[PDB]
Amino acid sequence: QPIIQFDAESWEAEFTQEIQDKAIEGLESGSVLFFPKLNFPLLTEELKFLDPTWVSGKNISYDPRSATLKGVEGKSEDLRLLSGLLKRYAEKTAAFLHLLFPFYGSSLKIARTSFRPVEISGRATSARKDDTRLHVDAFPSSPTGGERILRVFSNINPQGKPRSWRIGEPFQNYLNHLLPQLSPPAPGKRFLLYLFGITKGYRSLYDHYMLELHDKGKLDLEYQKNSPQVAFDFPAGSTWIVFTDQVLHAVDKGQFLLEQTFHLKVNALKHPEKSPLKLLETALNKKLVSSESFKL
Known part of the structure; x- marks a missing residue:
């Protein structure tokens, strides 16, 4: 169900638990x-x-x-x-x-x-x-x-x-499609990117593989053309909300957009196992962020 529609029309609307x-x-x-x-x-x-x-x-x-x-x-x-x-x-x-x-x-x-x-x-x-x-x-x-x-x-x-x-297929399918093309980072390279100020902070292995998925997916022309995707026009005066690190998306035309980014730690999610981090850690059987909290 790639797009879920809601009735709320006000920024201060209160919601039922059902919604x-x-x-x-x-x-x-x-x-x-x-x-x-x-x-x-x-x-x-x-x-x-x-x-x-x-x-x-x-x-x-x-x-x-x-x-x-x-x-x-x-x-x-x-x-x-x-x-x-x-x-x-x-x-x-x-x-x-x-x-x-x-x-x-x-x-x-x-x-x-x-x-x-x-x-x-x-x-x-x-x-x-x-x-x-x-x-x-x-x-x-x-x-x-x-x-x-x-x-x-x-x-x-x-x-x-x-x-x-355009909205693409679920993250797990995208990860699986591109998994044969993924590779580990060259040794020491992420450390140099951090030392030289090229990255703001240290690029974790999670961030490395998300970048490889991003880049190799964009270069996979057959996948760009044929993978499941729906084209949707967001009307003027509408708003939408999306985990953009998880929902495959592209934009084809339009002008004048307001956008607001929020960050959320994985352990605050209702279903952390659905996050791109946990799906990647499962697929590669590896801890992908070294600063991860440890649960005894």
Whole structure:
């Protein structure tokens, strides 16, 4: 069931336990939770930001923990306004997630907010960075140590244009398809990436294999073409929630997206065995993050 639809229309909506159970079971099973009527309105004074010329380099990014705006230049008043837009998205998504997922409690750790004003269809990068190819999230400069990547997305296009995604097959099937292509890292290489500041932190073995899955999957052209996948247009004014380290996804077109990343430790999950970390540790019969807590 790749997409599970929900009725909630408000960022401060309260949920029944039945809907909370439906959401957490679907999320952890690798479904996209879809809120077609959950719009994120903009203040009149923020409308000017619906313009790709605000990107100065990296996407526009905001750290709610440090209240720091990055990736955009301009006068202080405009940076204040844009900071306020992304801070409000951080606040609304964080409140929504605490209303929907009380099982996670205080284990949800907010990370960076992003605003994406560039039209997807006019982009072209390397095959590795190509976001029209199905992948899970794995970033070579930013290892996770096994922690989950949970993202909330809102399509805020003002001309009613949808955001066109494709959603692929379950993570376990993707892992199994690419398992013959995986290889261990070269000895000492991850240590040098850490010493030289290429990675922010140490790239665990989990992060190494997630990166190999990401990259080799994008380069597997037959898999990109023929593997099971559904094409879905997220309407303007909708919101969706997804473990993007688990749900295979790609984006084909669209413009103007708000996004909020959260991190969640594996042991806070209702079904930790469904996480990419545990599935990889099972497949390779190996501990993949050395800092892992030990259970007696």
